[PDB]
Every structure is written in C-alpha cells, then in structure tokens.
Write a protein that binds this ligand. Structure first.
Ligand SMILES: *[C@@](O)(CO)[C@H](C[C@@H]1CCNC1=O)NC(=O)[C@H](CC(C)C)NC(=O)c1cc2c(OC)cccc2[nH]1
Ligand SMILES: *[C@@](O)(CO)[C@H](C[C@@H]1CCNC1=O)NC(=O)[C@H](CC(C)C)NC(=O)c1cc2c(OC)cccc2[nH]1
Lengths: 302, 301
C-alpha cells in the first residue's frame, strides 16, 4: 500500500548520457550504438540563437567542430546530420551500454520519466505528464538541454522526449527523438506562450481511485451521473471530456474498489462545484491530474 | 526551473540488486563487493514470522540453504552471519558494479531515494523523508522487502534504509544497513503502531527559503525570535524542535537570501499562529516539509 509519484529506474538511460560542445555552447547528448542525438541549437552562438537558419549554420560546420565527451573519454565525430530539431553525430565507437530501445511520440495525458542531466552527467529523475497544451511541468536549469524522457517496458527503453526550452511561465517544452516539437514551439531565443491548458480528466479519476484504495473516502457521495452530464460540467471547469475508452481504461480500478466509473464522476463533479473545503486527498489541497490509470494500477493492484 | 520532488539517478543501486530465497520465502538483497545484505526474516516460513526466535531459526541454516540470484544467475553463498535485523551472506563473486559506498544512519527529516524492487528487479524510484515518528510514506507491495533507500554524494552512494514492514496505517518501517530499525518497530508479523507524527520544521524553513529565492516573500515579517522560544512555540503546533545541526544546515540558504535563520523562524511562527489566510507559497496552500535544505540547494543550483 501507499501511493507515490514514482519514476522508472534510470540506469539504462544513464549509460547513454554524454556531453556535446560546439564552440562555447555545451549541452547533453544521447549516445545509442554509434550515434549521439542532441538538440541542434548546440551549433549556435549567442547571436545565432535569435533567428537561426539551421541548414545554413550546419553546412558551415565540420566534424572537428563537435566535441563529444563520455565521462573522461573524448569520442571522435566522423559524420553529422540533422533531423528536424535534433542533431545526429556519428562517432567512431559504439556505446556498449546501449539498451534495447525505441523512439516513440507520446500522447497528451500520458506520463514519462525524465533523467535531468548537466554536462553529460545524470543529476535527478522525476515523472512528468505531457499536458494537453504540450508543455511539461519539470525542473530544468541551465545546461539541462538534451536531457531525455522515457518509459521502460520489459528491458526496452521507449524514448519520447528531449528537452529544449523553458517558457516564461516556468513550464518546459521539447521534442520527440525525431526532432519534432510537442506543441507550437520553435527552437529560437524568443518568449513563447503555450495554448490554454486543460485538466486531464481520466487521470484525476484514476487518482481519486488511488485515494479510495489508500483510505481517503470523504469525497464519495450517493449521487450518480450520466457520462454526458458529467462531461458538460467537466468542460465548464476546463477539464477534458471523458470518452468511453477512458471509462473502459478505468474498469480495473472500478472493479477493485466496487465504485462504478460514473459514481466516481459524480464525486468529481461535486468536488469541482463545491471545492475541497480545506480538506486534502492523498495529502494534496488540489486535484492531481499527472497520474495515468496505468500509473495507479502499478501501485494499487493487489 | 520549477520545484519538483526528484530522486537520485538509480543506476548505481540497480547494479547491486539481487534476490535472496530461503525455502519458498523470497525478498531483495543488496550485493556490494562479495557480500549480500538482506532482511533476516527471509529464513522464516509464513508461520515462523508470527513469533520468531531468529537465533534458533538461523542455527538450523547452512550456507547451502540460501539461494542468491542476480537475475537467473546464482551467486554461491560461502558464509553467513546475522547483524541485528539483517543477514549478511558472503558470496563467491565480487560485484563488478559495486559503486563507492558508505552505510549511514539518517535523522528524521532527512530525505532519500527509494529503489522499489520485486524479485531482485528494480521497478521504480521515488523520494521519501524519514518522518519524526520513524516511518516513511512509501509505496511498497508484497515482495518489496530488502528494497533500499540511499543518497548519492558525488559518486559515493550512502545507503540509509532497507525495507521490512508496512504498518496498519499504510506507512512503512525499516532498518539501516546495520539492521537497526528506525523507530520502535520489530520484525515480526504483528500490527504495530508508530508514535504521533510531527511536522519537520527544518524542512518547512528550507521551503520558505526556496520561496524567497524565487521572489515569493509576502510572509517575511519584521520580527526575530530566540531558538529556545521558537522551539517551545513550535511544539504547541505539532512541529519538531530545531537542533543546532538544523540551524547549521540552513546556513547556505540564509547566506544566499540574506535572511537570518532566526528571522525566518519568526516568520514561520506568524504563519503558524495566524494561518495562510487564503494565500499560497510556491503555488501551495500547505507548508511543505519533505524538502531538506540540500534538496532546495540541489534543485535551485
Ligand atoms: C538549454 O539548456 C540550452 O542549451 C536551455 C534549457 C533552459 C535553461 C533554463 N531552463 C531550461 O529549461 N534552453 C534554452 O535556453 C532555450 C534555447 C533555445 C531553444 C535556442 N531557450 C529558452 O528556453 C528561452 C529563451 C527565452 C526568451 O528569449 C528572449 C524569453 C523568455 C523565455 C525564454 N526561454
Ligand atoms: C516484505 O516483502 C516481506 O519479506 C513485506 C513488505 C510489506 C508487504 C506489503 N507491503 C509491504 O511493505 N513485509 C512484511 O510482510 C512484514 C514481515 C515481517 C517483517 C516478518 N510484515 C508486515 O509488514 C506486517 C504484518 C502485519 C500484521 O500482522 C498480523 C498486521 C498488520 C500489519 C502488518 N504488517
């Protein structure tokens, strides 16, 4: 028992982190087989970052302009290419610690673990949910670019995120491992705003089931609701509509607690309308939407 | 650059996790050099755990009764001994992945990362603070015993916790790596209660310093207090008294903000006596007590 925000063990990803330097710009890279993946803005100087013409900047670079360090061992760059916002550096040595891996693009509302790194050295690990507005609420400082997000399923690491930016609001933005940004962001030194965020409803419901499984029941009620009537109220409060697929995904948690999905919806409707009146759920004063049904099932099953 | 609960990268500890089995009883162990450390209750059947006499149960065991596996690979046991609530099994192979390490006994309020393991396979990593009542608010299921808690300073892993128990209230209890329980708990299949918990004052102060560093400082008042007067007031609000070590570990945050420790204590005292009055600190209506002064430095710098 107990319920805590938990990240995947980071060992398999730590063995892939390297430092990439070009001129006076330094960030992290991901070394898989004989290729190092990193944010392309490493080729920029402080003047270039304002309005970078990346294809022009890249053609002017040679392999010797890239310094790649794996611990206290320099890797020789023997080739380079660009795929959207990601730079790929071919090195003359293969990473013996390369795990089994895939590159995937995660969907909004899903979670992943972030291994925050500085100068190619792993610093910390935490969970993030990809918000509906395609930002993440992380903790990244200067030098964190190139840090990656991932999920692990049976010894296979699925990489889904590479860090590139911190918006003026304090949230973060990045790309998948094909170099495509999540959201309407661009890799230039400009203040960028995200679209209006919304709350991940299916995750709030999963978290309320985790609370019941762990002993918090004060918010339950004898009311019930239809799916549409719940969705009308959820949209009024800027929550995403709950689909029948989301209802089905909550099935195991409903079976475990004996609380029908629509009865938990009735509870959530009452919490949105009346507030929490100074009370807490799982020690939080706010409704939490960063746990998926899978994240809850992983800690509550049995 | 926001504030998140962050675990240490777990790789150095993942390379030390093994499974230990006696009969049909299985749990996790920690393999460092040629020794594996694990909870001594691995020598019990389910019925033996109700009322165990560990010394009598162990005299009946030989090295050949212990199965230690790193995945499916067996590590032959060549010596065994019990130290408090831990069993130490000497194995015939030195772990090539052994990091630089130390065994430490932490204080209440100190935080650490837990690598939750099942069958010797790491499944998740999360941060825990040792509560003043010597429990942790972890997430542990059947098979988690022997999972460890640690801190990482530079490249040295300081192991501080080994998991053994889940209390009726859902919180967790365990030992240090020398097998001494934190708190009054014993390793037997019995319902045990922890003492009344208190709020970790030094950590609340660290979180107020973190708010100030981020420009959130509405709560700073123009008063000061003595340490003794503050401790007496804090205890009326179920807050832990500060020690000289707590004042010293707040030193760097006090120097960074220019707010003396006792002036921050006077500000916290007013928050306790008057409340938050609908206001938030770092986007929270509650005072947070699970970030240490090092956790604040670690994330801000
Ligand atoms: C990388 O480490 C750079 O290599 C860095 C990560 C952030 C630094 C602080 N916390 C972080 O997450 N990213 C950047 O510095 C990027 C670089 C771009 C993609 C070329 N820039 C920003 O994140 C950035 C620029 C501006 C800005 O300008 C003007 C105005 C407001 C916000 C802002 N963020
Ligand atoms: C270990 O994995 C056992 O090897 C296990 C970890 C807990 C199981 C569920 N989550 C956990 O954290 N620990 C136990 O099962 C221990 C065994 C002791 C050390 C011999 N027992 C308990 O945690 C325990 C027993 C009882 C109890 O009895 C009767 C009544 C109430 C609570 C309770 N906890």
């Amino acid at each position: 028992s107990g319920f805590r925000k938990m990240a995947f063990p980071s060992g398999k990803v730590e063995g892939c982190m390297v430092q990439v330097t070009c001129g006076t710009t330094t960030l992290n890279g991901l070394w898989l087989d004989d290729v190092v993946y990193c944010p392309r803005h490493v080729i920029c100087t402080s003047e270039d970052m304002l309005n970078p013409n990346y294809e022009d900047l890249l053609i002017r670079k040679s392999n010797h302009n890239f310094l790649v360090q794996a611990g206290n061992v320099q890797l020789r760059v023997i080739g380079h290419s660009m795929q959207n916002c990601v730079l790929k550096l071919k090195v003359d040595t293969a990473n013996p610690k390369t795990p089994k891996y895939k590159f995937v693009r995660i969907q909004p509302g899903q979670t992943f673990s972030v291994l925050a790194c500085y100068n190619g050295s792993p610093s910390g690990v935490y969970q993030c949910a990809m918000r509906p507005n395609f930002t993440i609420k992380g903790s990244f400082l200067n030098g964190s670019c190139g840090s990656v997000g991932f999920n692990i399923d049976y010894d296979c690491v699925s990489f889904c995120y590479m860090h590139h930016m911190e918006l003026p609001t304090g949230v973060h933005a990045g790309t998948d491992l094909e170099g495509n940004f999540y959201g309407p962001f661009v890799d230039r030194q400009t203040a960028q705003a995200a679209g209006t965020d919304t709350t991940i409803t299916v995750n709030v419901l999963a978290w309320l089931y985790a609370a019941v499984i762990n002993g918090d029941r004060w918010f339950l009620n004898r009311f019930t609701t239809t799916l549409n009537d719940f969705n009308l109220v959820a949209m009024k409060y800027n929550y995403e509509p709950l689909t029948q697929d989301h209802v089905d995904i909550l099935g195991p948690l409903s079976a475990q607690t004996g609380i029908a999905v629509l009865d938990m919806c009735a509870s959530l409707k009452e919490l949105l309308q009346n507030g929490m009146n100074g009370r807490t759920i799982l020690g939080s004063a706010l409704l939490e939407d960063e746990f998926t049904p899978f994240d809850v099932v992983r800690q509550c099953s049995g």
